[PDB]
Scaffold this motif. Structure first.
Motif, PDB file in Angstrom:
ATOM      1  N   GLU A  31       2.183  73.764 -34.394  1.00  0.00           N
ATOM      2  CA  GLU A  31       3.216  73.105 -34.592  1.00  0.00           C
ATOM      3  C   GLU A  31       2.712  72.027 -32.737  1.00  0.00           C
ATOM      4  OE1 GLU A  31       5.653  75.854 -30.658  1.00  0.00           O
ATOM      5  OE2 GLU A  31       5.693  74.407 -29.854  1.00  0.00           O
ATOM      6  N   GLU A  32       1.486  72.591 -32.070  1.00  0.00           N
ATOM      7  CA  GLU A  32       1.125  71.316 -31.228  1.00  0.00           C
ATOM      8  C   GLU A  32       0.340  70.108 -31.609  1.00  0.00           C
ATOM      9  OE1 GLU A  32      -1.858  72.328 -28.605  1.00  0.00           O
ATOM     10  OE2 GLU A  32      -2.615  70.321 -27.866  1.00  0.00           O
ATOM     11  N   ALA A  33       0.870  70.119 -33.424  1.00  0.00           N
ATOM     12  CA  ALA A  33      -0.633  69.653 -33.607  1.00  0.00           C
ATOM     13  C   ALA A  33       0.740  67.977 -34.606  1.00  0.00           C
ATOM     14  CB  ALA A  33      -1.165  69.811 -34.851  1.00  0.00           C
ATOM     15  N   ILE A  34       1.566  69.131 -34.638  1.00  0.00           N
ATOM     16  CA  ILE A  34       2.776  68.235 -34.985  1.00  0.00           C
ATOM     17  C   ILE A  34       3.574  67.049 -33.767  1.00  0.00           C
ATOM     18  CG2 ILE A  34       5.021  68.569 -36.349  1.00  0.00           C
ATOM     19  CD1 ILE A  34       4.248  71.216 -37.896  1.00  0.00           C
ATOM     20  N   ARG A  35       3.481  67.652 -32.944  1.00  0.00           N
ATOM     21  CA  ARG A  35       3.666  67.177 -31.886  1.00  0.00           C
ATOM     22  C   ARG A  35       3.473  65.882 -31.664  1.00  0.00           C
ATOM     23  NH1 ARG A  35       8.050  69.669 -29.309  1.00  0.00           N
ATOM     24  NH2 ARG A  35       9.245  71.721 -30.134  1.00  0.00           N
ATOM     25  N   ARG A  36       2.280  66.072 -31.580  1.00  0.00           N
ATOM     26  CA  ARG A  36       0.917  64.815 -31.477  1.00  0.00           C
ATOM     27  C   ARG A  36       1.212  63.928 -32.595  1.00  0.00           C
ATOM     28  NH1 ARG A  36      -3.248  67.316 -26.837  1.00  0.00           N
ATOM     29  NH2 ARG A  36      -3.440  65.509 -26.995  1.00  0.00           N
ATOM     30  N   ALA A  37       1.103  64.649 -33.421  1.00  0.00           N
ATOM     31  CA  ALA A  37       1.123  63.554 -34.395  1.00  0.00           C
ATOM     32  C   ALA A  37       2.806  62.736 -34.491  1.00  0.00           C
ATOM     33  CB  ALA A  37       0.833  64.084 -36.371  1.00  0.00           C
ATOM     34  N   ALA A  38       3.905  63.457 -34.492  1.00  0.00           N
ATOM     35  CA  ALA A  38       4.997  62.645 -34.011  1.00  0.00           C
ATOM     36  C   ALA A  38       4.734  61.757 -33.192  1.00  0.00           C
ATOM     37  CB  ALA A  38       6.250  63.831 -33.922  1.00  0.00           C
ATOM     38  N   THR A  39       4.947  62.561 -31.604  1.00  0.00           N
ATOM     39  CA  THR A  39       4.073  61.673 -30.538  1.00  0.00           C
ATOM     40  C   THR A  39       4.336  60.072 -30.946  1.00  0.00           C
ATOM     41  OG1 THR A  39       4.436  63.590 -29.038  1.00  0.00           O
ATOM     42  CG2 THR A  39       4.401  61.425 -27.908  1.00  0.00           C
ATOM     43  N   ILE A  40       2.894  60.497 -31.855  1.00  0.00           N
ATOM     44  CA  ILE A  40       1.682  58.793 -31.190  1.00  0.00           C
ATOM     45  C   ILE A  40       2.842  57.903 -33.173  1.00  0.00           C
ATOM     46  CG2 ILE A  40      -0.178  58.547 -32.696  1.00  0.00           C
ATOM     47  CD1 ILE A  40      -1.194  60.754 -31.683  1.00  0.00           C
ATOM     48  N   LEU A  41       3.051  58.427 -33.932  1.00  0.00           N
ATOM     49  CA  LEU A  41       4.144  57.511 -34.285  1.00  0.00           C
ATOM     50  C   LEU A  41       5.568  57.051 -33.765  1.00  0.00           C
ATOM     51  CD1 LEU A  41       4.691  56.258 -37.164  1.00  0.00           C
ATOM     52  CD2 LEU A  41       5.849  59.019 -37.846  1.00  0.00           C
ATOM     53  N   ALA A  42       6.006  57.838 -32.831  1.00  0.00           N
ATOM     54  CA  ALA A  42       7.245  57.495 -32.221  1.00  0.00           C
ATOM     55  C   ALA A  42       6.823  55.947 -30.993  1.00  0.00           C
ATOM     56  CB  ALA A  42       7.753  58.289 -31.850  1.00  0.00           C
ATOM     57  N   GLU A  43       5.160  56.220 -30.782  1.00  0.00           N
ATOM     58  CA  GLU A  43       4.855  55.728 -29.519  1.00  0.00           C
ATOM     59  C   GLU A  43       4.514  54.388 -30.600  1.00  0.00           C
ATOM     60  OE1 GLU A  43       2.515  57.068 -26.220  1.00  0.00           O
ATOM     61  OE2 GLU A  43       2.748  58.796 -27.035  1.00  0.00           O
ATOM     62  N   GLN A  44       3.941  53.826 -31.700  1.00  0.00           N
ATOM     63  CA  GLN A  44       3.380  52.543 -32.154  1.00  0.00           C
ATOM     64  C   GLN A  44       4.803  52.566 -32.785  1.00  0.00           C
ATOM     65  OE1 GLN A  44       0.185  52.244 -33.455  1.00  0.00           O
ATOM     66  NE2 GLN A  44      -0.519  53.102 -31.505  1.00  0.00           N
ATOM     67  N   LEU A  45       6.216  53.069 -33.076  1.00  0.00           N
ATOM     68  CA  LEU A  45       6.504  51.855 -33.136  1.00  0.00           C
ATOM     69  C   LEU A  45       7.787  51.524 -32.306  1.00  0.00           C
ATOM     70  CD1 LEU A  45       8.746  54.024 -35.527  1.00  0.00           C
ATOM     71  CD2 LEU A  45       7.960  52.555 -36.284  1.00  0.00           C
ATOM     72  N   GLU A  46       7.477  51.355 -31.434  1.00  0.00           N
ATOM     73  CA  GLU A  46       7.960  50.696 -29.744  1.00  0.00           C
ATOM     74  C   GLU A  46       7.624  49.723 -30.249  1.00  0.00           C
ATOM     75  OE1 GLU A  46       6.619  52.467 -26.800  1.00  0.00           O
ATOM     76  OE2 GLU A  46       7.695  54.682 -27.668  1.00  0.00           O
TER      77      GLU A  46
END
Lengths: 230, 50
Positions: free
Chosen positions: A209-224
């Protein structure tokens, strides 16, 4: 008209190293757009811990032998760079190993520490074939991401290090296999929604779960860079 | 004429890289052109890359 949003429904733990997650509901054409992005993120960018240096006493380089120990020192270094360890509060730690007698030397013989733990206590490090033989070493463990070979950080800092500190190559990434599926979701009103199932195989040392949270966080911060342009 | 001699032995490790030659037992031979990331590789339905 607005899109529905996925939610992290269930996590099933098949083993200590292998797990399955499920995200639903998804609109049409969003199982692949999220599946491939998350598989490409999870395979290159997760952080973890690895062995970075060794010292054995009475040893000058890695092309030597040691009396009473039936492995060369290169084989011991190769057995050590496959050691999975988890560190709780620091970005660096130093462990010690002292053993004497006849028999195999495994990871259950490293000295106990408060905030460091070893997920596989039967990893084999070396063998002792003599009764008057003994080994003693001190092992440095660090935290990072990626793959850093020893011939690259020996160029990081240039000052003198003593003869007898042997460098090991660091593979930091804890994730080793990712697969995924898009199936038909079951929601009672519509039939044009799907679910996404991700299968994960790791070495311990990380939570799915923590791994998925980190992946989603990296993607969301790259889209900014796009969500707010110029 | 010579008074003494000293000899030194070095050891070097060599990892594979673009430009190195590779072959099989059937006459097929060629040069490596690229090392490319693990997640760019073709994979099968079970996640295993090639």
């Amino acid at each position: 008209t607005e899109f529905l949003k996925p939610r992290l429904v269930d996590i099933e733990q098949v083993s200590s190293t292998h797990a399955k997650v499920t995200l639903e509901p998804l609109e049409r054409g969003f199982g692949h757009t999220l599946g491939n992005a998350l598989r490409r993120i999870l395979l290159s960018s997760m952080p973890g811990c690895a062995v970075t240096e060794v010292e054995i006493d009475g040893v000058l380089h890695e092309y030597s032998t040691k009396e009473g120990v039936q492995e060369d020192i290169l084989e011991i270094l190769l057995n050590l760079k496959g050691l999975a360890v988890r560190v709780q509060g620091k970005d660096e730690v130093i462990l010690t190993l002292n053993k004497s007698g006849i028999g195999p030397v495994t990871a259950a013989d490293i000295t106990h520490d408060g905030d460091v733990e070893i997920v596989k206590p039967q990893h084999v490090i070396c063998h002792l074939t003599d009764e008057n033989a003994s080994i003693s070493m001190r092992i440095k463990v660090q935290r990072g991401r990626g793959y850093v070979p020893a011939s690259t950080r020996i160029h990081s800092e240039e000052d003198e290090r003593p003869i007898g500190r042997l460098l090991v190559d660091a593979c930091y990434s804890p994730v080793e296999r990712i697969a995924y599926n898009v199936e038909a979701a079951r929601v009672e009103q519509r039939t044009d929604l799907d679910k996404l199932v991700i299968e994960m195989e790791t070495n311990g040392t990380i939570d799915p779960e923590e791994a998925i949270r980190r992946a989603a966080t990296i993607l969301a911060e790259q889209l900014e860079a796009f969500v707010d342009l110029r | 004429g010579v008074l003494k001699i000293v000899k030194v032995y070095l050891a070097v490790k060599r990892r594979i890289q673009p430009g190195d030659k590779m072959a099989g037992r059937h006459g097929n031979k060629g040069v490596i052109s690229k090392i490319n990331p693990i997640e760019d590789m073709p994979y099968d339905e079970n996640g295993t890359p090639v």
